[PDB]
């Protein structure tokens, strides 16, 4: 925490509260969250490569 | 160090002492660039013969 400039993984909640995005070094995965804490398995984890 | 000196000074003024660690490292361009990391007294136990 003290001596790092960037995190390893970041979990981001959308400003509308509907989607949750998990960020990594090269890619981030977007998850559909209808209810807080509810992540249905029917949804497909969209993968985006920000690079 | 412009910002880490603040933490080093805070630790030294609070606990009475503080430490900074200078270990070898490599910069983006190569050559040789040491890294300086402020160390809290609560995470280091330094032993001196004097």
Distance from CA of A20 to the nearest CA of B (A): 33
B11: enclosing H helix or E strand: helix B4-15
Alpha carbon of residue B24 to chain centroid: 13
CB atoms within 10 A of CB A24: 14
Contacts of B25 (CB under 8 A, 6+ apart): B32, B33, B34, B35
Resolution, angstroms, 1 dp: 3.7
Q: Which B residues 22-41 touch A at CB under 8 Å? A: 37-38
Strands A28-32 and A19-23: antiparallel
Alpha carbon of residue A30 to chain centroid: 5
Residue of B19, B24, B26 lying closest to B42 (CA atoms)? B19
Half-sphere exposure of A15 (CA within 13 A, CB side): 0
A30: left (phi over 0), alpha (psi -120 to 50) or beta: beta
Q: How far apart are CA A32 and CA B42, in angstroms?
A: 43
């Amino acid at each position: 925490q003290i001596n790092d400039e960037y995190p390893k993984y970041a979990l981001e909640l959308a400003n509308n509260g509907k989607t949750v995005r998990l960020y990594t070094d090269t890619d981030y995965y977007e998850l559909r969250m209808p209810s807080p804490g509810n992540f249905p398995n029917e949804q497909v984890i969209k993968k985006v490569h920000h690079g | 160090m412009q910002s880490k000196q603040i933490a080093i000074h805070r630790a030294a003024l609070t606990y009475g002492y503080s430490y900074a660690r200078v270990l070898p490292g490599v910069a983006l361009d190569g050559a040789n660039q040491a890294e300086i990391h402020g160390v809290s007294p609560r995470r280091l136990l330094a032993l001196y013969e004097d």
